[PDB]
């Protein structure tokens, strides 16, 4: 009964960050050595926990949040960060306890003009772990939009122009945010030991 990090990290299709996919990891024994040890990652930052020490450490619930942003936005997947993603797509709490794992996916998500979406406009910042999937025509002006695009009325999602030749900051990056839950409940996710 091993935890399915394979169908999270090695998943063929990742999700757009506005609709970031969350996988509930429970009732299994995750081995995080496969992650922190093995694979070539552009970013593997852990907050409130050290990647080595989880191999014998139980958690009541682990949440694997996968999505796609571009290089310049991987820095926004952190506690106390701002920007397009952290405010309107995927917000981490300031007291976040978990690891943010990201890797370049230029060869996977850039073809010729693959299209991942991300939320441009939102009236307020996302609460931690909030997931806004509404396509309500965003109201920038004073006149209500009534679901028709126009001036001052914009579709709140926009496609990443993911094209292979992009600069590293513009190339797509796949992000998996493992958040570990300290609940007052039976522990369902543990290290192998």
């Amino acid at each position: 009964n091993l935890c399915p990090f394979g169908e999270v990290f090695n998943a063929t299709r990742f999700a757009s960050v506005y609709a970031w996919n969350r996988k509930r990891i429970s009732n299994c024994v995750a081995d995080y050595s496969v992650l922190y040890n093995s694979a070539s990652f552009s970013t593997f930052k852990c907050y409130g926990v050290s990647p080595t020490k989880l191999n014998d450490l139980c958690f009541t619930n682990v949440y694997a949040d996968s999505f796609v942003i571009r290089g310049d936005e991987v820095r926004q997947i952190a506690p106390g960060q701002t920007g397009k993603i952290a405010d309107y797509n995927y917000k981490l709490p300031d007291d976040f306890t978990g690891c943010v794992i990201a890797w370049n996916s230029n060869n996977l998500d850039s073809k010729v003009n693959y299209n991942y979406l991300y939320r441009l406009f939102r009236k307020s910042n996302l609460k931690p772990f909030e997931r806004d999937i509404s396509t309500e025509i965003y109201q920038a002006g004073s006149t209500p939009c009534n679901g028709v695009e126009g001036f001052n009325c914009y579709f709140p999602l926009q496609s990443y122009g993911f094209q292979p030749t992009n600069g590293v900051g513009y190339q797509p990056y796949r992000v998996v945010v493992l958040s570990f839950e300290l609940l007052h409940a039976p522990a369902t996710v543990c290290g192998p030991k």
């Epitope: 310049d72 936005e73 701002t82 920007g83 397009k84 952290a86 405010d87 309107y88 003009n113 441009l120 406009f121 939102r122 009236k123 307020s124 910042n125 996302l126 965003y138 109201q139 920038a140 002006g141 004073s142 001036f151 001052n152 914009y154 926009q158 122009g161 993911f162 094209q163 030749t165 992009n166 600069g167 590293v168 900051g169 513009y170």
Partner: antibody
Framework: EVQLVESGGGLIQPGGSLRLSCAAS????????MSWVRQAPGKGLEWVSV???????FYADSVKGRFTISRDNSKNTLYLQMNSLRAEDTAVYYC???????????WGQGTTVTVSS | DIVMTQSPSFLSASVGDRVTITCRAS??????LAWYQQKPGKAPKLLIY???TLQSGVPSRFSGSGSGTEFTLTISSLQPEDFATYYC???????????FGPGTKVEIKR
């Protein structure tokens, strides 16, 4: 009525502060990316700052820690407080409406800020 | 560093000419470019966004083309109004929100 009217520019000594106001009409500033872009005389356009709809503010490293972008939802106004001004900040400052890839579709007339000792 | 370069710096053409202004990103920005017109004194005016889409209210003779590292702004038939300076800007250019080009000034040929 789809206009951006900024003021508050002028001639100040270096180190002195100066506040640019940008009254908006035809759009809500709190519902928009509102950015300040400056252009030195005879030079190109330089991004100064931006305020998101959610409230998060960003600045160019050239003005980081000296400038403060804000807004008045009541007055539907954008503000750029320029503290410890340096002569390098001498430029025409345009209040524009950022739309990330939809572009800076609506610009203000622009207010001149001359900083010199 | 990601730098935007405009060529030529000054361009000379007559009313009715097809003019093409080249913009070059040091690395690919795939379609995250806008094209702006500025006259002396007046504010910049957005002409093209997403490197090809024409802004509402902008003459149809303006067109934006190119994806990635080399972009063009084309006026099929130059009008008296189109004598101005043209700037290409980089959208979402992380450290600064926007990175503008050096500017191309279209001039009357004689």
């Amino acid at each position: 009525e789809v206009q951006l009217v900024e003021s508050g520019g002028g001639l100040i000594q270096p180190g002195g502060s100066l506040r640019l106001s940008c009254a908006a009409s035809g759009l809500t500033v709190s519902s928009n990316y509102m950015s300040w872009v400056r252009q030195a005389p005879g030079k190109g356009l330089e991004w100064v700052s931006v305020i998101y709809s959610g409230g998060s503010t960003f600045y160019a490293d050239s003005v980081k820690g000296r400038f403060t972008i804000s807004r008045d939802n009541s007055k539907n106004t954008l503000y750029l407080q320029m503290n410890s001004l340096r002569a390098e900040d001498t430029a025409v400052y345009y209040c524009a409406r950022d739309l990330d890839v939809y572009g800076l579709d609506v610009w203000g007339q622009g207010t001149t800020v001359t900083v010199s000792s | 560093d990601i730098v935007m370069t405009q060529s030529p710096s000054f361009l000379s053409a007559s009313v009715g000419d097809r003019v093409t202004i080249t913009c070059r990103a040091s690395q690919g920005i795939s379609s995250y470019l806008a094209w702006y017109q500025q006259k002396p004194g007046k504010a910049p005016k957005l002409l093209i966004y997403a490197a090809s889409t024409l802004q509402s209210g902008v003459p149809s003779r303006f067109s934006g083309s190119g994806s990635g590292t080399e972009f063009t702004l084309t006026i099929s038939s130059l009008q008296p109004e189109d004598f101005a300076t043209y700037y290409c800007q980089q959208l979402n250019s992380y450290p600064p929100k926007f990175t503008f080009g050096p500017g191309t000034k279209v001039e009357i040929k004689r």
